[PDB]
Design a protein around this ligand. Structure first.
Ligand SMILES: C[C@@H](Cn1cnc2c(N)nc(N)nc21)OCP(=O)([O-])[O-]
Ligand SMILES: C[C@@H](Cn1cnc2c(N)nc(N)nc21)OCP(=O)([O-])[O-]
Ligand SMILES: C[C@@H](Cn1cnc2c(N)nc(N)nc21)OCP(=O)([O-])[O-]
Ligand SMILES: C[C@@H](Cn1cnc2c(N)nc(N)nc21)OCP(=O)([O-])[O-]
Ligand SMILES: C[C@@H](Cn1cnc2c(N)nc(N)nc21)OCP(=O)([O-])[O-]
Ligand SMILES: C[C@@H](Cn1cnc2c(N)nc(N)nc21)OCP(=O)([O-])[O-]
Ligand SMILES: [Ca+2]
Ligand SMILES: [Ca+2]
Ligand SMILES: [Ca+2]
Ligand SMILES: [Ca+2]
Ligand SMILES: [Ca+2]
Ligand SMILES: [Ca+2]
Ligand SMILES: [Ca+2]
Ligand SMILES: [Ca+2]
Ligand SMILES: [Ca+2]
Ligand SMILES: [Ca+2]
Lengths: 269, 279, 268, 277, 272, 273
């Protein structure tokens, strides 16, 4: 890929946003599928349709034009993405991840990512919440990477490390807060693997992914994390296990919303 | 992202339906060396890929592909003699273009065949492997014929692939194979597709086998994904033309010979199976 | 799919052939931090990549690459000081453009070197790993310098890659290392290439190791594939500059010395 | 080669028809400084170009265009406030996208207005010129919104342009103008379109006049061609905001322009009652 | 800068040379309604454009073009039945691809024909206009089949175009027209090419006429330019099928047959 | 085409040049075909190949790669282009004109453009030097313009005027300076018309162009002038009439080059500021 955005594009978008809202969030949240209801938990919200924001990719699915919402979650100023972009919709990664770099320029310091995923870990049950401790970037293995192209030093280094991508401290807080919520099910934890999609996996692919050490599978999130870490954002996230993948040839969403809301109090600064 | 619009598929289907009175219910994509299947076909009417509107055109000089409509074993079908591969430069939305056209022609079942390298230790050159499942390596990185906005007139946004290879046809393939009475048993397994065109290193071969792959090739998977997305029943076979070497210690005319004989066997197998396809 | 036509490779080769009287028999691609190999050349003649027709141009500012012709250790060769990477935005047909040009110049052997992360826990920082085999992850998805119609004037449609790293040179590499009487042993293993530019997560590292990989990098494999397709003998090394995270320089000069020594073991 | 397929136009039309109850019969493309027409419209409903599926988005940072539906003077209209130009980088198939959408909405007449430079020596700043014909310079080189395979559902392969500007509306324009009781006559002439964005050199101005042109601009023609191709009745005007320089050797000009704009706006409103059906 | 590389042309030429034994010395590009010239051709071998390697493919539905080799009037030639136009979406380097292939086949003379609108008021519907010169409007803005680095194996960087339409053939055309038994004079003039697909407004027609144009169309010029660049002898005609509107104020089937017969006769006048 | 270069690209190229040379040119000269010898006669010259300069378009003709040369001409520091880019070679105008914007960022205030052209005016003879008083941009009529695309306000306005593109003062000084030279032939003056190329004109086209009011015809320069005026550069230039265009259907260099070169050197002293 040849990242089509120039440094000034990001600046223009950030400048437009900074002049259209007086809010200055320190945390950005990307709402996964069916988790958009999180925006309704914000107070003093101001919304911007993706379509009106300069340089912003526009939603694909008809009748579901995305929105960027600035607001207060749990005493914390946030900027949230209601609706996201996926590689399977035809968006190259430099477009899918455009918002992450804009957030960095707005002054955001932490990125919370959430998604709905397929459970590969045999212990997982539909409705479980999995704290993402690590990921496997399959598209990245072949070069499909949002960082492809000459490096923009104003954002980060040429070869950013990913071994510490999911903040270790937030991990501990996530477990503490979960116990405070008193759930019948434990807080799951593990590796998220991303693949292109849009078709779901065959049985042989699921077995293969599980042996790769993956716990949950999806078609997003990884590109955003890579860009976030590259530009210095702290990151943490969760996968909502909406289905158990088929391994043989033979509500929960509100809980996650509450969980993310409570964790706002655990984000540094 | 797919460059064809819904009406492009319709225009091609309309062109074909107006140029032939045949109305096939089954489509067959012949792999390499299985091109002889077109013979054995009766009342055949041929269209060179090059003359069909919107149809991708062959790459290998002197081997322009052809779409042939004819009767195989009393069953009307349309066959692809020569196919398209990612390694030739075609994106998957072009490689799989014909599959959606077939659906629009009224086809309800797609039969896919190919030549593949054997990964399973029980496999021998000349074996025929019923495809029970597949591993789409290109799909892992986003190279997918379904990439782009979803066309609901074909299928859903997130089509399932766990039951891609028809279970009923699998049972019929096994019973038919027995009725054929062959020296070798009908193998069965997972086909893994990778880009090509170079063949694998020993390390890649060991890796693929560990992934659970039984046969390796550079086609078929894309077609199957598109077929399932638009509702086509699918079943297919891999002709094992060569055994892959799994180690460094281990150090041809007979290999080619075993391949040609196996190919004739696959042709008869596919012909007999026509009677087993429902409807 | 490859945007260069056969005549483009020829035009570039002729330009070089008419701008230098040297006729290299060996080509060397210098990995990261190994550019110093060029200084060992004598009778050196340099050409900036930027001035050579059809040649891709470096991306990192202040580090414009160069093609240098000269004698290393009694052998005529052409060296690449600075390389091209997929992570930089180049499609493989551009990354490997030079390999086909070298073949047209008359080169018969290609030496590939690179810096890599150590996956095999036996490797220590500074170790040299003779490349015995490779795993082309980008190739699994079709990202291949050979993608597109085949140019028979270079090679066959389906080149074999199982015998990519010359067995003879691998034996001489081991014999030469012992003759040098080095304290540390000469490592050997499988090199796996992934796109980059980010480094691996712990999960990816564990995965790659289980795939049978000993060293990981973001180059070399494309050039090797193209080299073998057009008939070049191939051998190379990874300089293990770091041990990848598996849980939650005199070394470079030694490689440069070793590669220089092996020039004498190259046939013809 | 057009980048939109027939169904893209239908999608946009369907979207609009399901987001407004207004059913326009006439479309108005407002020229530079003529966006005030949108005011004086009642029962108005606005859509930013940015939110409309497939619609090109304005380049000029600061004035994101919008589509406005409403009743003008007894007629249901859809108006473009903000336009697209070739000089901005839009290929003609994007510039004219709205025209085909309008036809699919049920629009039967297209009114095009623009600000233009005066080539006719008799023209004065503030004059309003009924467009009687045009000269498509970009079309001479193949830059044409119709380039590519023809879409028969819109129109024929070789559309005629000799009768592009409706003769009946031309008579209606002169009648309505006369009734308004204006002292300055309603000018009439040929509009020539060129790419832009730079203004003409003296040599170019003379050349243009010798070609038979009365006014020069960088828009409108592409739209008129697409409109006639899909069967829309067309008529329009050029507001002469400046006299081009013809020799090698202001507040009043601005004023005459401002007043002429208001005048053209009133003129178009009145003309709504003379549109057939 | 032209999508095709020299070897692309060679491949196509080789394909044709190995699929037919005929070796044409002349090539004819049939205009609108003049495809019937392919008939009255003996020992004809036809190839659909679609099957010929690198050949552009027709856009008009149900009218797939074809290349036909055969003897016309004692001369071996290759004819294009159906052509390519910029208004259809083809860049000029594609529209003119066949011309360079013809040169590589051994063709020495190119006969171009087309249907055109009459600008010269002296012209009447059905008239045949010998092309004496042309005006390349798309060329004024850089839209040219020769745009890009020059391929010397074909021609020079800056080819002259003032002597594009062979003087001798034009003189031969006027002398041969006699035996056509036509009571109508053989017209002659300047052909002006513009993009299309829409027809001219009144103002454009008056303008084109004042430019010195006698007939207007949407083709031919790109082919002539490439033909002259690679050294081909060029000869051409426009069939005036309509008189453009110059103010706001069955027969054609016979006219085409007339041109076809005329072109056939001229075969005997082509040198060598 | 809406121009593929971003503002920062021009800045990057200017910064690179400014850090590789200490010279601060106030004048930029684009040498036409056969006028390349102007680079000589330049003192304290520093040269840069187009190929090594970041973002710089590269020459197409094999064996003759272009160079950017910085030096002193006649007491005036300047930068010259030896080798140019033409639309007929495949370059879009945003590439052809890239150097002009870089010059502006380098601190250049005046652009001198020269070229070889065909004479349309019956009074011109081969070897005549024609001061460009105005131009006709044929490609511009159809939209082929280096300014196509969103306007970059940091360079100039959206609708720049071109009625006064060729500096009147320099034109007056050119005629006065020519006098001093005491040449036999007079310094011609006229309208330059730009066509795409690469083929030369037919008789019909030549007659057409003359009727359009053109005095000389060529395939360059106009784009550079348009971009120069857009970013506020003072402009003046000349066409060396290398050939006389044929207008009659019946009808069957070096020398002036050096002359134009010494003339341009002389004019350096007349350039303001
Ligand atoms: C489709 C959904 C992800 N997603 C949910 N379930 C699955 C599954 N079984 N397999 C794959 N490959 N992806 C799955 O997207 C949710 P997101 O937008 O929040 O990432
Ligand atoms: C090249 C052949 C497939 N094909 C046959 N053998 C192999 C092998 N060992 N490795 C790979 N990667 N592909 C193999 O194509 C046959 P198809 O066109 O019928 O798929
Ligand atoms: C970045 C460097 C390669 N390279 C060096 N270390 C690593 C590492 N840990 N992981 C990956 N993926 N690549 C690594 O490139 C060196 P080359 O240009 O000589 O290939
Ligand atoms: C710039 C303005 C048109 N426009 C106004 N005056 C001129 C002029 N002198 N020359 C050219 N070429 N165009 C002119 O656009 C107005 P529109 O958007 O309503 O067409
Ligand atoms: C459409 C036809 C040309 N063609 C025929 N009549 C006209 C006309 N009045 N105006 C224009 N611009 N073109 C005209 O093409 C015929 P050809 O394919 O033989 O060139
Ligand atoms: C080819 C030369 C220009 N050039 C010189 N003479 C002519 C002529 N008669 N017609 C056209 N169209 N161009 C002509 O280029 C000179 P430059 O590079 O200095 O512009
Ligand atoms: Ca938008
Ligand atoms: Ca786990
Ligand atoms: Ca075709
Ligand atoms: Ca270069
Ligand atoms: Ca439809
Ligand atoms: Ca939009
Ligand atoms: Ca008039
Ligand atoms: Ca050759
Ligand atoms: Ca074809
Ligand atoms: Ca360069």
């Amino acid at each position: 890929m040849q990242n089509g955005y120039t440094y000034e594009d990001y600046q223009d978008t950030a400048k437009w946003l900074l002049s259209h809202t007086e809010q200055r969030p320190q945390v950005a949240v990307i709402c996964g599928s069916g988790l958009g209801g999180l925006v309704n938990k914000l107070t003093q919200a101001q919304t911007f349709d993706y379509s009106e924001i300069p340089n912003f990719p526009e939603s694909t699915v008809p009748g579901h034009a995305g929105r960027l919402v600035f607001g207060i979650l749990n005493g914390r100023a946030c900027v949230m993405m209601q609706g996201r972009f996926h590689m399977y919709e035809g968006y190259p990664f430099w477009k899918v991840t455009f918002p992450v770099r804009v957030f960095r320029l707005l002054g955001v310091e932490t990125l919370v990512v959430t998604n709905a995923a397929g459970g590969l870990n045999p212990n997982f049950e539909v409705g479980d919440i999995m704290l993402i401790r690590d990921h496997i970037n399959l598209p990245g293995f072949s070069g499909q990477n949002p960082l492809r192209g000459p490096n923009e030093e104003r954002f980060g280094v040429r070869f950013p490390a990913m071994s510490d991508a999911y903040d270790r401290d937030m991990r501990q807080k996530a477990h503490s807060t979960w116990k405070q919520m008193g759930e019948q099910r434990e807080l799951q934890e593990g590796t998220y693997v991303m693949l292109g999609g849009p078709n779901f996996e065959t049985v042989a692919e699921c077995r293969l992914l599980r042996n790769l050490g993956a716990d949950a599978v999806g078609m997003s999130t990884v590109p955003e994390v890579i860009v976030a870490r590259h530009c210095g954002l702290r990151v943490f996230g969760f996968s909502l296990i909406t289905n158990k993948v088929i391994m043989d040839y033979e509500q929960a969403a509100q809980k996650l919303e509450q969980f993310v809301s409570l964790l706002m109090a655990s984000i540094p600064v």
